[PDB]
Amino acid sequence: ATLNQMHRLGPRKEPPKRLGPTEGRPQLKGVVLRTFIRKPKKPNSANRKCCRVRLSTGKEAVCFIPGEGHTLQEHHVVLVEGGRTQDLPGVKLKVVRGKYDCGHVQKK
Amino acid sequence: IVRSSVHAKWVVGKVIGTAMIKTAKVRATRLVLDPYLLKYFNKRKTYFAHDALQQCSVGDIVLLRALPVPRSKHVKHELAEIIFKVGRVIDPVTGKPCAGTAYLESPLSEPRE
Amino acid sequence: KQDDEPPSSAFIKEYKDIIPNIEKVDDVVKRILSLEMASRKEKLKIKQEQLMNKIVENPEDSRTLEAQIIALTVRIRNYEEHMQKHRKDKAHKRHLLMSIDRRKKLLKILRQTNYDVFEKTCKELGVEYTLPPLHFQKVHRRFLAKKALCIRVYQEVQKLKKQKRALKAAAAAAKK
Amino acid sequence: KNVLKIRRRKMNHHKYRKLVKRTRFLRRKVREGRLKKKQIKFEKDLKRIWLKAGLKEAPENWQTPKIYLKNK
RNA sequence: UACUUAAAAUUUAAGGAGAGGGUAUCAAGCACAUUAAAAUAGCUUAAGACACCUUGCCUAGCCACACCCCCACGGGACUCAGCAGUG
RNA sequence: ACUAUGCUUAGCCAUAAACCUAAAUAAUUAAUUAACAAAACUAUUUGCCAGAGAACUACUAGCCAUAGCUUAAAACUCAAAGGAC
Ligand SMILES: [K+]
Ligand SMILES: [K+]
Ligand SMILES: [K+]
Ligand SMILES: [Mg+2]
Ligand SMILES: [Mg+2]
Ligand SMILES: [Mg+2]
Ligand SMILES: [Mg+2]
Ligand SMILES: [Mg+2]
Ligand SMILES: [Mg+2]
Ligand SMILES: [Mg+2]
Ligand SMILES: [Mg+2]
Ligand SMILES: [Mg+2]
Ligand SMILES: [Mg+2]
Ligand SMILES: [Mg+2]
Ligand SMILES: [Mg+2]
DSSP string, C104-163: HHHHHHHHHH-HHHHHHHHHHHT----PPPSS-----HHHHHHHHHHHHHHHHHHHHHHH
Using the CB atom, is residue B12 less than 7 Å from strand E? no
CA of D52 to the centre of ligand 6 (A): 29
Backbone angles phi, psi at B45, to 5 degrees: -130, 150
Distance CA A10, CA B54 (A): 41
CB contact under 8 A, B41 and A6: no
Physical contact, B and D (3 or more Cβ pairs within 8 A): no
Using the CB atom, is residue D30 less than 7 Å from strand E? no
Three-class SS of C14-78? CCCCCCCCCCCCCHHHHHHCECCCCCHHHHHHHHHHHHHHHHCCCCCCCCCHHHHHHHHHHHHHH
Task: Name the DSSP letter for residue A62.
Answer: E
Burial of A50 (0-12, 13-18, 19+ CB in 10 A): buried
Distance CA D53, CA C154 (A): 8
CB contact under 8 A, C145 and D62: no
A18-26, long-range: CB within 8 Å, 24+ apart, which pairs? A20/A82, A20/A92, A21/A61, A21/A82, A21/A92, A21/A93, A22/A80, A22/A81, A22/A82, A22/A93, A23/A57, A26/A81
Using the CB atom, is residue D23 less than 7 Å from strand F? no
Q: Which residues of B55-92 are buried (b: 16+ CB within 10 A; e: fewer)?
A: ebbbbbbbbbbbbeeeeeeebbbbbeebeebbbbbeee
Chain A partners within 8 Å of B36 (Cβ): 6, 10-11
Chain C partners within 8 Å of B87 (Cβ): 110-116, 118
Which residue, among D45, D51, D59, has the nearest Cα to C159 in the 3D structure?
D59
Distance CA B79, CA C139 (A): 36
A48 has which bridge partners? A38
DSSP run (H or E) holding C85: helix C65-85
Contact A66, A81 (CB under 8 A): no
C56-59, long-range: CB within 8 Å, 24+ apart, which pairs? none
Contact C35, C8 (CB under 8 A): yes
Which residue, among C92, C97, C9, C13, has the nearest Cα to C47 in the 3D structure?
C13
Using the CB atom, is residue D36 less than 7 Å from strand F? no
Breaks (C-N over 2.5 A) in chain C follow: none
A36 has which bridge partners? A50
| Bridge-based pairing state of the strands A93-95 and B75-84 | unpaired
Distance CA B10, CA B24 (A): 16
From residue C77, give the alpha-carbon distance in Å to each of A21, C68, C99.
73, 15, 10
| Chain B interface includes A3 (CB < 8 A) | yes
CB contact under 8 A, C113 and B17: no
Closest CB to D67: pick one of C141, C156, C157: C141
Q: How many CB atoms lie within 10 A of CB D11?
A: 9
CB contact under 8 A, B39 and A7: yes
The amino acid at C113:
T
| Bridge-based pairing state of the strands B40-50 and B23-33 | antiparallel
**Residue A5: closest CA among chain B residues belongs to which residue?**
B37
Burial of D14 (0-12, 13-18, 19+ CB in 10 A): exposed
Contacts for B79 with CB less than 8 Å, ≥ 6 apart:
B24, B49, B50, B51, B52, B55, B56, B62, B63, B64, B65
Distance CA D46, CA D23 (A): 35
CB contact under 8 A, C110 and B87: yes
From residue C75, give the alpha-carbon distance in Å to each of C12, C40, C51, C58, C72.
18, 12, 13, 21, 5
Give partners of D (≥3 CB pairs < 8 A). Answer: C
Distance CA A34, CA A73 (A): 7
Compute the nearest-CA separation of D71 from chain C (Å).
12
- Which chain E positions have some atom within 7 A of a protein CB? 14-19, 22-23, 27-36, 38-47
Of C residues 47-76, those with CB within 7 angstroms of nucleic strand E are none
Task: Name the DSSP letter for residue B65.
Answer: E
| Chain B interface includes C17 (CB < 8 A) | no
Q: Which residues of C63-102 are buried (b: 16+ CB within 10 A; e: fewer)?
A: ebbbbbbbbbbbbbbbbeeeeeeeeeeeeeeebbeebbeb
Please report, to the nearest 10 degrees, the dihedral formed by the alpha carbons of residues B15, B16, B20, B22 taken in order. Answer: 0
**Residue D65: closest CA among chain C residues belongs to which residue?**
C145
Contact A29, A101 (CB under 8 A): no
Distance CA B23, CA B73 (A): 13
Residue A14 (CA) to nucleotide E23 (C1'), in angstroms, measures: 12
Please report, to the nearest 10 degrees, the dihedral formed by the alpha carbons of residues B97, B98, B103, B106 taken in order. Answer: 10
No. of H helices and E strands in chain B?
0, 5
Compute the nearest-CA separation of B53 from chain C (Å).
20
Rounded to the nearest 10 degrees, the angle between the axes of helix D24-53 and helix D4-22 is: 80
Contacts for C146 with CB less than 8 Å, ≥ 6 apart:
D45, D46, D49
**Residue B61: closest CA among chain C residues belongs to which residue?**
C112
Backbone angles phi, psi at A51, to 5 degrees: -150, 150
Q: What is the experimental resolution, given in Å to one decimal place?
A: 3.1
Compute the nearest-CA separation of B83 from chain C (Å).
14
Using the CB atom, is residue B38 less than 7 Å from strand E? no
From residue A79, give the alpha-carbon distance in Å to each of B28, C40, D70.
64, 95, 60
Distance CA B12, CA B7 (A): 13
The approach used to solve this structure was: cryo-EM
B17 has which bridge partners? B25
Q: Where are the beta strands (DSSP E) in chain A?
A: 28-38, 48-55, 60-64, 77-81, 93-95
Contact A92, A84 (CB under 8 A): yes
CB contact under 8 A, D59 and C157: no
